[PDB]
Amino acid sequence: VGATTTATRLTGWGRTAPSVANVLRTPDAEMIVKAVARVAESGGGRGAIARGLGRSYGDNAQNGGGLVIDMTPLNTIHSIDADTKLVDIDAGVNLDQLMKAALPFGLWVPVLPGTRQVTVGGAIACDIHGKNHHSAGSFGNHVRSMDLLTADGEIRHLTPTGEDAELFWATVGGNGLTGIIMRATIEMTPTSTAYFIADGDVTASLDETIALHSDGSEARYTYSSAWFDAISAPPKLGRAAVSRGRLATVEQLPAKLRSEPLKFDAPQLLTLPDVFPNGLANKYTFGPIGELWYRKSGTYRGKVQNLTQFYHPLDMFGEWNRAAGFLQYQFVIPTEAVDEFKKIIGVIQASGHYSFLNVFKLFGPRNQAPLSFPIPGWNICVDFPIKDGLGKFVSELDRRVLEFGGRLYTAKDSRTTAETFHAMYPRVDEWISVRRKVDPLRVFASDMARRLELL
Ligand SMILES: Cc1cc2nc3c(=O)[nH]c(=O)nc-3n(C[C@H](O)[C@H](O)[C@H](O)COP(=O)(O)OP(=O)(O)OC[C@H]3O[C@@H](n4cnc5c(N)ncnc54)[C@H](O)[C@@H]3O)c2cc1C
Ligand SMILES: COc1ccc(CNc2nc3cc(C(F)(F)F)ccc3nc2C(=O)O)cc1
C-alpha cells in the first residue's frame, strides 16, 4: 500500500485540543526519511512529529499546521531469539502484537501498560511504566538499541551505554522530540508460562493502604497495583483493592493448564454489562454485609490468573467504564513525602470532583532519562468528569504536586503550563540542550512541545 498525505483533525485519547496536520502514512522507510529531509530543507517551518496508536491522552502526537507521521504501518517483527532474549522490531509494532508473537519463545514483554494498544515507539517516547515498575523499571530500561531518524536526515544507531548514550536517554521519554524511532531491539523477560500467581488484599482506609505498601511486602512481588477509593469521606477515603503477584512457573499451574503453559486465551464475548445490564448493586452493597463481601472476595493467596484476570481486571466492566467528557490526571509524589501525598488525596476528596477509577501504585527507582516520568514514590491516576471549576482545580493540584516534589505525566497531560512542567522536571534544561544540539532548526515539533516550551 502506497503513501498517503491527508489533512487530518487529530486529538489524543482524551478527544480534546484538536488541531489540523498533514498525516503521512506509509510502510516505506525511505519515504519517511524523505519527508524529514523535506521538512529540514525548508528548513524552518512548523516541523514534524511521529504518531503511534494515539493512546496518549494529550497533545504530544499532534502538530497543528505541520506534519504528523503515522508509524503504525511500519509494523514488522524482524526477529525474536529465545537464547539472547532479544526482539528486533519496527517502531510501529504494538505491545499486543509483540506479546502474542513472543510467548511461543517463552518471552515476556518486560513492561506492559494498562492497554496493549501502544506502539514500541510510543512506549519508548513516553518511557511507559507498568504494574511491575518497582521491580523492572520503565520501558526505556529494557531497550538495548534503537535507530533514530534525526533532523540531519541520517539514521543514528543508539545504545544505552555507547557513544551517544546521551541522545539515547534524551529519546527515552522525549515525546518524539529527538527524531523518529524507526526500529529497536528490546530485551525480553524469560517466562515458562502466560500466567500469574496472585495475592489480593482489601484495605479499609488510606492509612492501611500506605502501611501495606510500606511494611516491606512489596519486595515479595514483581507486580503490584491497587484500585483506590477517592470519593468516600475519611476514614473510608483511600481504601483499596490491592492486586499483587508474579509470573507463574509451569509447576505452579493446575494440571489442566500445564498442557499449554504459554497459551493466551481469547477475550470472552460476554462482559458484565451484558450479563447484568442495570448494574451490580443490591440492598446489601453499601452496608456492613457489602463491606464484608467485598473484603472476602478481594482477599486471597496464590490464585492462578491469566493476563486479563490479573492485569486487565476491569475489562469485565466493559461498557461501564467512563460513561470524552473526562480529564485524566496522573502524578507521583516522592516516597518520603507520605503526609504530603495523604494531604493531596484529602484535597481531591473534598474538591467536589468525583473520580470512580483510581489506579494506585508504589513506583521503584527511576532511570537516567532526564524527562522520564517515574520516580520512586506514590503514583496515582484519577479520572475526573469535565464540569465547572475543574480546570482551575487541577491547576491547584499542579501546584500541590509541584510543591511536594512530584510531577505529572506527559502521556496524560493536555493542560499544564510550561512553567509548572519545567519546575516538576529539574533536568529539563539538560534535556533541552541535547535537543537543540540534535535538532537546531526544530525539524521536530508538536503541540505539546509548543505548550510546554520544549521546542
Ligand atoms: C486505557 C489506557 C491505559 C494506559 N495505561 C498506561 C500505563 O499503565 N502506564 C503508562 O505508562 N502509560 C499508560 N497509558 C499511556 C500510553 O501507554 C502512552 O500514551 C503511550 O505513549 C501510547 O503509545 P502510542 O503508540 O499510542 O503513542 P502516541 O500516543 O501515538 O504517541 C505518544 C508519544 O510517542 C511519540 N512517538 C510515537 N511513535 C514514535 C516513534 N516511532 N518515534 C518517536 N516518537 C514516537 C509521539 O510523538 C508522542 O510524543 C495508557 C493509555 C490508555 C489510553
Ligand atoms: C475501559 O476501562 C479501563 C480499563 C483499564 C484501564 C487502565 N488504565 C490505566 N492503568 C494504569 C496503571 C498504572 C500502573 F498500574 F500504575 F502502572 C499506571 C497508569 C495507568 N493509567 C491508566 C489509564 O487509564 O490511563 C483504564 C480504563
* 80 assigned to a ligand binding site: no
Query: How far is residue 338's CA from residue 167's CA, in Å, rounded to a whole number?
Result: 34
Alpha-carbon separation of residue 149 from 6, 91, 157, 437 (angstroms): 22, 11, 9, 15
For ligand 1, atom 5, the nearest C-alpha belongs to 114
Please tell me the distance from the alpha carbon of residue 449 to that of residue 455, in angstroms, as a whole number.
5
Coil, strand, or helix at residue 303?
A: strand
Question: Ligand 1 centre from 59 Cα, in Å?
Answer: 11
119 is in an annotated binding site: yes
Q: Three-state SS string across 211-241, please?
A: HHHHCCHHHHCCEEEEEECCCCCCCCCCCEE
Range 96-104, long-range pairs (CB < 8 A, 24+ positions): 99/264, 99/307, 100/264, 101/77, 102/188, 103/194, 103/262, 103/263, 103/264, 104/262
- What secondary structure letter does DSSP report for 119? B
The residue contributing the CA closest to ligand 1 atom 18 is 56
Task: Identify the H or E element spanning 182.
Answer: strand 180-187
Nearest CA to ligand 2 atom 13: 130
- Residue (of 48, 92, 54) closest to 71 by Cα position: 92
> What is the rounded distance in angstroms from the CA atom of residue 13 to the CA atom of residue 444?
21
Question: Residue 6 has which C-alpha cell?
Answer: 491527508
Report residue 257 as a C-alpha cell: 493448564
- The three three-digit cell numbers of residue 311, written as one number: 492485569
Q: Are 320 and 273 in contact (CB under 8 A)?
A: yes
Which residues lie with the beta carbon below 6 Å from any ligand 1 atom? 13, 49-56, 60-61, 71, 91, 113-115, 118-119, 121-122, 125-126, 128-130, 175-176, 180-181, 411
Distance CA 16, CA 39 (A): 27
Report how far apart, in Å, the C-alpha atoms of 312 and of each of 194, 216, 279, 361 are.
14, 25, 20, 15
Among the bound ligands, the one closest to the CA of 360: 2
The whole-angstrom separation of Cα 338 and Cα 398 is 17
Cell of 27: 510502510
- Judge contact between 353 and 384, C-beta under 8 A: yes
**What amino acid is encoded at 88 in this protein?**
D
Breaks in the chain (C–N beyond 2.5 Å) sit after 323
Return the C-alpha cell found at 256: 489442566
* 18 alpha carbon – ligand 2 mean position (Å): 23
CA distance 399 to 205: 25
Instruction: Report residue 71 as a C-alpha cell.
Output: 508509524
Cβ within 8 Å of residue 59, ≥6 positions away: 11, 12, 17, 19, 414, 446, 447, 448, 451
Q: What's the start-to-end Cα distance of the chain, in Å? A: 33
Is 55 annotated in some ligand binding site? yes
Distance CA 57, CA 371 (A): 18
One-character DSSP codes across 359-397: EEEEE----S-TT----SEEEEEEEEEP-TTHHHHHHHH
Give every strand in the sheet of 359-363, ordered side by side.
300-305, 196-202, 240-247, 223-228, 359-363, 377-385, 326-334, 407-408
Yes or no: say if 262 and 100 are a contact pair by the CB < 8 Å rule: no
Contact 379, 360 (CB under 8 A): yes
User: What is the Cα–Cα distance from 141 to 158, expressed in whole angstroms?
Assistant: 14
Determination technique for this entry: X-ray
Separation CA 20–CA 126 (nearest Å): 23
Give the whole-angstrom CA distance, residue 390 versus residue 410. Answer: 19
How many beta carbons lie within 10 A of that of residue 277, not counting itself?
A: 8
The residue among 205, 316, 306 whose CA lies nearest residue 253 is 306
Cα–Cα distance, 286 to 318 (Å, whole number): 22
- Pairwise CA distance, residues 327 & 107, whole Å: 35
Ligand 1 atom with the smallest distance to the CA of 55 is 26
385: nearest Cα among 361, 359, 357: 357
**Backbone Cα Rg of the chain:** 22
- Sorted by sequence, the CB contacts under 8 Å of residue 183 that are 6+ apart come out as 78, 88, 89, 90, 91, 146, 147
> Cα separation of 53 and 75, whole Å?
12
CA distance 91 to 72: 8
Dihedral sign (CA 50, 53, 56, 62)? positive
Measure Cα distances from 310 to 110, 123, 196, 245, 252 in Å.
16, 21, 7, 8, 16
